[PDB]
Design a protein around this ligand. Structure first.
Ligand SMILES: [Mg+2]
Ligand SMILES: [Mg+2]
Ligand SMILES: [Mg+2]
Ligand SMILES: [Mg+2]
Ligand SMILES: [Mg+2]
Ligand SMILES: [Mg+2]
Ligand SMILES: [Mg+2]
Ligand SMILES: [Mg+2]
Ligand SMILES: [Mg+2]
Ligand SMILES: [Mg+2]
Ligand SMILES: [Mg+2]
Ligand SMILES: [Mg+2]
Ligand SMILES: [Mg+2]
Ligand SMILES: [Mg+2]
Ligand SMILES: [Mg+2]
Ligand SMILES: [Mg+2]
Lengths: 206, 206, 206, 206, 206, 206, 206, 206
């Protein structure tokens, strides 16, 4: 479709990615990065379109995508980047930075709710309804459905708008500096997950 | 005693504190910084002596101590600095930095135990036995006992040795960079505690 | 509308409030009064209308509303006043009294259920259906919607009727005196919450 | 002994009780006042002696003791009066008042510990060691041992000293007014226990 | 209606009750028999009709109903008689016996489910759909609704049919003798509840 | 129907069972094999038809079915065979082997979900919707309904297709060898359940 | 010794057992009667001596002991008979009756404690100290130690004294009738354990 | 000492290992094999001596030890081999087999206890007291203490005796075949741990 570009292995070029921030999500075979391989990277330059990239089993390189991940002048926007950063670093050897996490930003601004999922915050903050996938998907399937492409694109099509609103909220309630420190630490939080502390709050007393 | 110097309100001067790192702990009326005032600051320059400073109710200033807290060329060593940093920032208005936390360092090196208390790690890493206070203390008492001064000093007399050993262990098992990122974030972790997130892991999914 | 009067900062006058009891609720940025500011005070004199007052960030005074809060000849009716009393005292410096809490009264009369929410008790006791707000609201928004005004007004439009029925039930089952003692203590319960005991039943054994 | 006077049913007179406050504890057959009868009332006028009164099965009256319970000019001191007030009111028909509870006072002053038992607070606040009874006692036995009399007396011999110290601590940390409101409510808390709410915090949200 | 006869205080006579078994349920102000008075007794002779008896506050006698409760030649059928037996014994001073409990019988026969409620077992065993009351009822109300009468009657209109089917199932799977021993003990189980063991399995190890 | 053949006690012959694998499920009176007898065995040769065999109370033999269970050249396919293997071994004295368990295979392949029920995996892997039985069934009833026969047949009509897809997934993600070792152990796991370890993970540390 | 007579398989005669009550305990290979065989029966006629009977693997008969178990004129005293009754009935085919259980009697009299073990109640009620076995024993060993014989005898040497005291306590606090009903039901409680309800309180609501 | 031979990296030869079974344990930096490297392998040929082998950081080969691990004619005895098998396979690339696990064997024989630790079973089954290490050890230390060597040797010096006794117990209580099936599966259980199922019972329903 005009909204969703599908690719195998990597972006074909970075012509669409002369931007200051990109929105990223991933699909995997599950929540254990050492067991469950990366299957899809979905990314948007913020212009209302998305690229959905199918990652092959055993794929070690994605040079164009990795250029964006390494580029320190490009902010990588995630919703709950803690997981995606670990998966991406594990897959391609580069820990993306710098980052903005809309879920951390939601936790620091939407102090009246415990519901910080992407669907909930898109409805509340953007008046955008994204459909939640009900049946679980084998994202390692050789052929991905158009339904799967649409779900994957919906994860990134709105993160730039979400970041814009959450930055306003962070400034309004006075927590911009703390959010930024969380974003600076988040790559280390993901590293510690890969290293063996996925189940531990390193800052907890016990 | 020759090991422990007692002071009211503040250090009398910084003649003893021409150092690159200081060891710090505090005593309070309890674990809620908004309710439970700061009562004692104990600090050591690492030379085998300690200063124990009695903090008065309503005391808003401690200029000599605060000079050390603000001095970015002086590393402040804590065991579980997350709490002390919040108490100190709440009391005097300065968030101390930069910091080294021996409890975070223990969690990242002593991967074979869940026991990361100061007494346990001093015994294991330093062959130093520190006596644990058994009965709970009113640290807001007008007169502090010599026993209380000794307990307070024991909290800081060994942190320089502990940091030396833990830095070696961090380098041996390859986690120096992650530890340093945790130390950079820790002042924000303490800020978030004071701001209302004391009971939340900001990096958790839910 | 004729049912709902909107105001900024404060009631314009007390012409509508020559009454023996007022019904009050609040909206905030969340459940932590030290973190989450007061955003809305909604109040009804019991005549089938409601005033919805938008409270600005940093607002320290609301003189007309505070006159009602201080007036010991005016009973302040809440549903779960424990929270609202703490928020109001924190915002404006006056602990409202005397009070009647329809949730405490429900607990002492509706001994056949664990459901003591306002919607449930309005349906059962008054045959009045109030719509529950489904999506969470940013009550600190510069502009409040008419939907938000209606939700806020629904919190206070029926508390006088509810108190009338609950007083009858308290007398029928013989617990008026105990309810009144609870209402006398409730301002202290809210004070203790602000002081640091929000998570503790002060009367519990342990 | 000179410290402990034993009585059957009631105090023989109130010659020893021309005082402004009395210290009281009880022994029962267990923690359920409707099932487990009152067996012993122990009381001290604060002069370093104690009266231990054996209560018979089915005993409905204790006129001299009840005169003290009703006397509003005499403060009844308990450690955790919530239970004793319910037992006494159930046994003799009078809810004692006014009261001072050293356990509530401890909770409001000893903010650095979760240990608020009588033995712990006597050691810490009074430097008085009271022996804890290790084996459980049948307090309904026809004959009480001297050991049992000593345990019962130890419960009341020090409450006046404890109240003196805790009043100083309440004033030092600024919570005298809140403590007094708790003491005023406590008789109602005990009434609500007898009425069927022993397992419910009436002030809880849910 | 022809199915439901309403009475105040007691059955007018026992002309309808020349039977070998009666079906009984009750309504109360809640689940604590010492606090929550008996409000309704509903009873059926098994002929497809039901008597619904409104019990007044403070009512100590119901002579015709109590004749049935005491009559050892008449089996009293309950669904979960453990509660009703305690309420009835508390209200009128007679522990009904002998009894049959369809819930105990269900537990001993319907070994393939954890759902032993009356609605579930009537649907499964009788192909009879009884409507569950959704909103909670004040059964102490001076005036009971026809809806309330129908709910109360539905509790007893089918227990004879249920007992017939459950007796067949008990015989089929070989547990008639154990069921009968449970029914013989059940009045004592209800007595122990009234005596103070409502929260304890007396046969448990600990 | 042409899809479902009903039998009493046993298959009439094995003309339909000249196959390399059979799909099997059972129905019982509940989840405790020592208490809850086998009531139904449902089996399919994989050709789109199913045999539903009613097992009588006290039935000790089913010679034709047991020939299939013992035949080591015939793989017995189950969904969660752990339970069925114990029930079958308990009923007829033969532990079926070798086996394939689609639930173990699902756990080893569908690493992105915790939902491993037959309905869920048939929908996801086969695009086959099987209706879940909502009301609980007495499977020991003398007469089984056509609805019950259809539910029982649905348990086995698709297991050959499910095994085909799961074998492909096991090979794709590299866990065929581990799955096969689990299938070899499963008969012992069921034996240990019958022997008294039904509630213990024998491989757990503690 | 003169206190302990050892036997293989059975009592040699009943010359010592012309009594109205016997005290009984057992030893097994564990707490699951279907898995863990009976190994020892220890029994006392109440005269200060005990018989310890070693039960062989596969032993189906113990005629002299079983005569006592069946004899309805002989009360069988246990501490927690619920388990021993199931083990004995499983081993020899006779459910012993009538019974007295000192643990049920303790629960109904010692309302001031949750500690109802034999050692605790012997110390408190009899002033008799019995040594608890610290290391776990293989009671199926071909040769039992004298230490094991002494432990086994200590289980029964004092139950007659314990029953005497507990009967007095039951009469004093008015619960003799309820205790007797519990003793009448206990054989059924043990039957239900053997039948498959060992983990269920049959009288519970859910 | 004559009992303990220390080696760096590997056994110097297999002259001592012309045996049918070897006893093995390991020491690591913690319980996560992907994070916590192998530090020590301790092994005994069953002759009352032990070899303690220090494993270097990054060591990928131990050819003589690995010859024993691969040798299918040599049974590898562990206490809780589930962990050691994963650590050894992760370190050197060979999954040891066949195996005997004394902890699984204990679980299948010592049905009267939940205590299956090596110290407990050595005391009970062998009358051998092994000292438990109290303080936690850094097993990655460049220099291991003689105390550490003795602890490590104590883990393997008695496993042959333990296996001898447990085989007798397995035969006595009839579970040899089930134990052997568990031992055959255990290498797969350890593989599944390394693959990502360390926290899941693969045989559980859910
Ligand atoms: Mg996604
Ligand atoms: Mg994401
Ligand atoms: Mg300290
Ligand atoms: Mg500290
Ligand atoms: Mg509101
Ligand atoms: Mg409210
Ligand atoms: Mg006492
Ligand atoms: Mg007391
Ligand atoms: Mg009912
Ligand atoms: Mg009922
Ligand atoms: Mg089935
Ligand atoms: Mg199945
Ligand atoms: Mg025993
Ligand atoms: Mg016993
Ligand atoms: Mg070891
Ligand atoms: Mg081991």
């Amino acid at each position: 479709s005009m909204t969703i570009r599908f690719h195998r292995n990597d972006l074909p070029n970075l012509d669409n990615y002369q931007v200051d921030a990109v929105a990223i999500d991933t699909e995997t075979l599950g929540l254990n990065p050492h067991r469950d391989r990366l299957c899809v990277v979905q990314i948007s330059p913020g212009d209302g379109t998305a690229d959905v990239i199918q990652i092959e089993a055993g794929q070690k390189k994605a040079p164009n995508l990795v250029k964006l991940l390494k580029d320190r002048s490009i902010t990588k926007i995630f919703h709950f980047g803690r997981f995606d950063l670990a998966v991406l670093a594990h897959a391609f050897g580069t820990m993306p930075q710098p980052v903005f996490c809309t879920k951390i930003a939601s936790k620091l601004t939407r102090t009246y709710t415990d519901r910080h999922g992407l669907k909930e915050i898109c409805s509340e903050l953007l008046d955008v309804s994204i459909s939640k996938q009900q049946q679980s998907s084998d994202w390692a399937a050789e052929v991905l459905s158009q339904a799967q492409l649409e779900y994957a694109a919906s994860d990134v099509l709105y993160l730039h708008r979400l970041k814009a609103v959450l930055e306003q909220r962070l400034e309004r309630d006075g927590r911009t500096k703390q959010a930024e420190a969380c974003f600076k630490f988040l790559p280390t939080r993901s590293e510690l997950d890969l290293m063996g502390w996925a189940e531990s709050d390193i800052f907890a007393h016990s």
